[PDB]
Every structure is written in structure tokens, then in C-alpha cells.
Paper text:
Prohibitins are a highly conserved family of proteins that have been implicated in a variety of functions including mitochondrial stress signalling and housekeeping, cell cycle progression, apoptosis, lifespan regulation and many others. The human prohibitins prohibitin 1 and prohibitin 2 have been proposed to act as scaffolds within the mitochondrial inner membrane, but their molecular organization has remained elusive. Here we determined the molecular organization of the human prohibitin complex within the mitochondrial inner membrane using an integrative structural biology approach combining quantitative western blotting, cryo-electron tomography, subtomogram averaging and molecular modelling. The proposed bell-shaped structure consists of 11 alternating prohibitin 1 and prohibitin 2 molecules.
Notably, the map reveals a large empty cavity on top of the bilayer enclosed by the bell. As the structures of PHB1 and PHB2 have yet to be solved experimentally, we relied on AlphaFold2 to predict the structures of full length PHB1 and PHB2. Numerous possible arrangements were tested but we found that each of the 11 densities in the cryo-EM map can accommodate only one prohibitin molecule. The final molecular model comprises 11 monomeric PHB molecules forming a bell-shaped assembly. On the contrary, adjacent PHB C-termini interact more strongly and stabilize the centre of the bell top. We also identified self-linked peptides where the same residues were crosslinked in overlapping peptides, thereby indicating the occurrence of homomeric interactions.
Author numbering:
A (entry chain C): 627 to 789
B (entry chain A): 165 to 272
C (entry chain B): 373 to 522
D (entry chain K): 3074 to 3127
Write the structure that this text describes.
């Protein structure tokens, strides 16, 4: 029950909603890295009055981009471009915990934080392609080593057998 | 005068002869220069190969030194196997006989 | 002689508009840009040789960008990007591209040969190592008596 | 001149350089002196087409 002109309910959605924030940041190497952070978060149900008074209705737009950009740049600066490719999970975790810590102050809870599409787009293909070729050759080298071992093994067994 | 340019230095009969003569002679020059440079290329290839082996030998020696005597010994065996193969490279496989086609008659 | 077409992206600074209008007029882009661009481009280009223009183009473009930016700023213009497009001669451009194509391919092939040489050297060493260890293993294996070796 | 260049290159490249160039050439010569290539094999034969009644 509400009193019609006197009070107005402001209905917030407690559901988790995804938010993607694209950010261009530099790595330690000074390489330009485009990363879009995918964030799923929702408001803490008890804090709603506080959030509304402090930040406002639009608090998702106001707070999220700022903190996310800040944290992501701070984290990314630590690692070099090469690490970002191999180490991605570690970076995502670190971004997640620091972001969660920061978010908590505002009364937001983050369900999940994940780095999505580390790029540019031209870079998507180039990077994957380069890694692919390297991988193929490396693995073929692997085949070579294995095959050599097998032949050595066969030689041993044959000699034993003849024995 | 905005521009002055000679156009069509000829005459017609000789014009054709002239172009043709130019082409052939130039090709000859092309051949001569190309052959010399290619000779240089082969020169280079030989040098790089020699240095390549050189480095390979150094690396192999280094690797065997690390891998010890046993390493050297069977490298020697491998090489011997290779040499033996090259000395005699040939072989064949035997098969038993195949057949030919024929007509089958089905009995009543 | 070098023919170059410069492409520039620009926008006026919002705060300076009144100055723009007073000094230049509404026609600010047509009056100022061609003049400044030609002047700067000529000044920068004069410093470099033709050969450099081909290899160095990124450097030249940045240099022109910086100089143009400085000049533009006084005009109260902001340049988002400045890039040299189409550096050329009529026939000469075509020949130039062909020459580059050929040289690039030969260089790459040269690397092919070197790389393959490296690979073969590595294969040779690995096989030598392999045989070696195989020998060691065989010898140790012989421990299954002399009948084994026989 | 190739000989000359090689000699000079070997000199810069040191002794190790000369040694394996020597082995390279030796292998090359041995290679040509006895050259031939053979192949491994996979045994096989045709099969039969049999109709099964249904």
C-alpha cells in the first residue's frame, strides 16, 4: 500500500545484469591493449536506500565505468602483453578481487568478472594465427622426438627379442 | 610554351626494326647480368652452407661433450647406419601371386 | 618531385568559436587548412630524401602531424588524425610497387633457406643424441646376459 | 673467388667453421658418388565383393 502523491516507490532490479565496459589500456610494455571487461553484478538488497541517496538511480552508469576503468588499468599496467595472453586467468582473478573490494564500498556485489576479447580485432586473428603456426611446428617437433624415441625403443626390443 | 616534347621518332619501317632490335639486344644484356648475379648467389649459398655445417659441427661437439662419450658413440653409429644406407640404397618386397578375372557360371 | 595526398580529420575547438568566426569567418576550413597543410608538408618533406619517404613514411606522417597540430592549435582547430595517402609518381609508382614486391619476396625466400638450414642442423644433432642414448640403452639392456647381445 | 671467399669466411668463422664445412662437402660428395632413393612399403591386396541374401 502506498500513498499516491506523497510517496513513490522506486523499484530497483536485484537481478544480476551483465555490463560490458570496453577499456583501452597500456600494458607495462607500453603496448596498447583493448580489453572489454564483462561484469555481472547486482545491488545489495539491504543497501538500496544508501545507494539511492548517495549515488542515485543511475548508479550503475555512474560508478561502474569509473571503478572498472581505474582498476583494470591499474592491474594491466603490472603485466606485459605476453603475460596477458598466457596469464589471463590470473589477471582476471586479480581484477575480480580488487573490483569486488571496491564495489562493496558502494554496495554492489559482483557475481562474476571476466576479461573478454583481448584485442584489437585485427589482433584477434593475427595473434591466434601466429600462435597456431608456432604450435603446429612445435608439436610436429614433438612428433619427431616421440618417433625417435619409439624407434629407439623398437630397436632395443628387437635386439632383446633376437637375443 | 607550356611544354615541348618530341613525339614519334621514326620512320615507320625502321621504327619497327628499331624497337625489335632494342628488345633483343636488351634481353641479351639481361641474360648476361642475370647469369653473373646468379653465379654470385650460388657462391653465397656454398659459403653459407659451409658455415652452416661449421656451426653444426661446433654445436654437435658441444652437445656430445655435455652428453658425454655415450652420446658420441651412438651418434657415430647413426652416422655409420646412414653411410651404410647410402652406400647401398635399394631393396624390394616379395609378394605371392595375384589372379586374373574369369567368368563364373552359376549352377542350376 | 613527389606527389602526396594528405588526409586530415579535424574539428573546431568549442571554446574558441568566437575567435574563429572573428578571425577566419564561417569558411574557416577552406581558408586555413589548405594553406597550412601545404606549407607544413612542403617544409617537412624538404628535409627528407625520396628513399626515406618510402621506408620512413610513418615517421614523416607523425612529424607532419605534430607540426600541423601545433599550427592548427593557434587556429583553434583540433586534428584527430593526419595521414599521408598516395605517395607517388605516375609510372614510377607502379614500378616502385613492383620493385618492392620482388625484393620482399627474395628476402623472405632467403630466410626460408637459412631457417631450413637451421632445422636440418638441429635434426642432425638430435638424431646424433638419440642414437647415442639408444646405444647407451642397448648396452645397458645387454645386461640380460651375453645371449642377449648375441 | 668462391674459394677465396670461403677461405676468408672460414678465417673469420674460425677453425670450427672450416671443420664442418669440410664435413659438409664430404657428405655432399659422398652423397653424389652414391645416390639413389628407395621406399618403404605397405602390403595389401584386393578384396572380394560378396552379395548376401536378405
Amino acid at each position: 500500500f502506498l500513498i499516491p502523491w506523497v510517496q513513490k516507490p522506486i523499484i530497483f532490479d536485484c537481478r544480476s545484469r551483465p555490463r560490458n565496459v570496453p577499456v583501452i589500456t597500456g600494458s607495462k610494455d607500453l603496448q596498447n591493449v583493448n580489453i572489454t571487461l564483462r561484469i555481472l553484478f547486482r545491488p545489495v538488497a539491504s543497501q538500496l536506500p544508501r545507494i539511492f541517496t548517495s549515488i542515485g538511480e543511475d548508479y550503475d552508469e555512474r560508478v561502474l565505468p569509473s571503478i572498472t576503468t581505474e582498476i583494470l588499468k591499474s592491474v594491466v599496467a603490472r603485466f606485459d602483453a605476453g603475460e596477458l595472453i598466457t596469464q589471463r586467468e590470473l589477471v582476471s582473478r586479480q581484477v575480480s578481487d580488487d573490483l569486488t573490494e571496491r564495489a562493496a564500498t558502494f554496495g554492489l556485489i559482483l557475481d562474476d568478472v571476466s576479461l573478454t576479447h583481448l584485442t584489437f580485432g585485427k589482433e584477434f586473428t593475427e595473434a591466434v594465427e601466429a600462435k597456431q603456426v608456432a604450435q603446429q611446428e612445435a608439436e610436429r617437433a614433438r612428433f619427431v622426438v616421440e618417433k625417435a624415441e619409439q624407434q629407439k625403443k623398437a630397436a632395443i626390443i628387437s635386439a632383446e627379442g633376437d637375443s | 610554351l607550356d611544354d615541348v616534347s618530341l613525339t614519334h621518332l621514326t620512320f615507320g619501317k625502321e621504327f619497327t626494326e628499331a624497337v625489335e632490335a632494342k628488345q633483343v639486344a636488351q634481353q641479351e644484356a639481361e641474360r648476361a647480368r642475370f647469369v653473373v648475379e646468379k653465379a654470385e648467389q650460388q657462391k653465397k649459398a656454398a659459403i653459407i652452407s659451409a658455415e652452416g655445417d661449421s656451426k653444426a659441427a661446433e654445436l654437435i661437439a658441444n652437445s656430445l661433450a655435455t652428453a658425454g662419450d655415450g652420446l658420441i658413440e651412438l651418434r657415430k653409429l647413426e652416422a655409420a647406419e646412414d653411410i651404410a644406407y647410402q652406400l647401398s640404397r635399394s631393396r624390394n618386397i616379395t609378394y605371392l601371386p595375384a589372379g586374373q578375372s574369369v567368368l563364373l557360371q552359376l549352377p542350376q | 618531385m613527389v606527389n602526396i595526398s594528405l588526409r586530415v580529420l579535424s574539428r573546431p575547438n568549442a571554446q574558441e568559436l568566437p575567435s574563429m568566426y572573428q578571425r577566419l569567418g564561417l569558411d574557416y576550413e577552406e581558408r586555413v587548412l589548405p594553406s597550412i597543410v601545404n606549407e607544413v608538408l612542403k617544409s617537412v618533406v624538404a628535409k627528407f630524401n625520396a628513399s626515406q619517404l618510402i621506408t620512413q613514411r610513418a615517421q614523416v606522417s607523425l612529424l607532419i602531424r605534430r607540426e600541423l597540430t601545433e599550427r592548427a592549435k593557434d587556429f583553434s582547430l583540433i586534428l584527430d588524425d593526419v595521414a599521408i595517402t598516395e605517395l607517388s609518381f605516375s609510372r614510377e609508382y607502379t614500378a616502385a610497387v613492383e620493385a618492392k614486391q620482388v625484393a620482399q619476396q627474395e628476402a623472405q625466400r632467403a630466410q626460408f633457406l637459412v631457417e631450413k638450414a637451421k632445422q636440418e642442423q638441429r635434426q642432425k644433432i638430435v638424431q646424433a643424441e638419440g642414437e647415442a642414448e639408444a646405444a647407451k640403452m642397448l648396452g645397458e639392456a645387454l645386461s640380460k646376459n651375453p645371449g642377449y647381445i648375441k
